[PDB]
Structure formats: structure tokens, C-alpha cells
Amino acid sequence: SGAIYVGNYRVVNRHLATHNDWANLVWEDSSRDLLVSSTTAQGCDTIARCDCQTGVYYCSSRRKHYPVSFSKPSLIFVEASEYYPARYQSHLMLAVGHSEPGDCGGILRCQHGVVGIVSTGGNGLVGFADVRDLLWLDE
């Protein structure tokens, strides 16, 4: 679990969104596993606007942060689950690192700010849904 709080927005994995998230829906994209809902309290996370491929992510299953090199956002195959059929997930970045069910939502950050959130894993890999292209989060 986990979320990004920026301005009057909350960014979460679409498959983990709550009833409150859907009742205050701003935008969602099943192909990216992202949902953005509106908030009453002001968020103070900063979003990165860059092409970094190195950063640090929070891994809940280890209660630790790990440094990673990660790929450029791209269309990557994701296996079937109770939330989605087998499909290509867009804007996804892979890294070699530990992740297991429960880790979705952990933030990936670089020196510029928040890059994205854990969305996939398995096999000594971890996948992050990028948010750097969502320029409207800042306004």
C-alpha cells in the first residue's frame, strides 16, 4: 500500500483505490494502474520532471529503502490477476530489486522528487508506474 499527496490530489495504484477515491475521482487509467482522487487537505510531495534512471524506492516487505537503476517508461507485459486480465501496462519502468505482493504503492524518488509508485513485481524485479509525465498534478 501507499500514495502520493501533491496539492489537492492523491495518486494511488488503481487496483488499490478505495470507495472514497472513486467518489472523488479526477482521472484513472487502467492501462497504467493509476488513479488520482481529489483531497481536502493540502499535500506537500514534489513531483520530479526529468529523465532520471536512478533513484531510491521504499520496500514495505523489507521496511527499507533500496537504490535502483530503472528502465525508461514503456509498454510491458503484465500477467493476469484478480484486478486485471493479461495485458500491456503502459508508462511502466522495471528495476532489479526485491518486491512481493503488498509492496504496491511504495514511492520511487530521485534527486528531483517523486518519480512513481511500485505497481508490479516478481522474479527479482520491481515495476514502477511513472507519474513524471502528469504535468497537471502541479496545478
Ligand SMILES: C[C@H](C(=O)N1CCC[C@H](C(N)=O)C1)c1cncc(F)c1
Ligand atoms: C503479482 C503482483 C503484481 O505484479 N500484480 C498484481 C496486482 C496488480 C498489478 C498490476 N499492475 O497489474 C500486477 C506483485 C508481485 N510482486 C510484487 C508486487 F508489488 C506485485
Ligand SMILES: [Zn+2]
Ligand atoms: Zn530526476
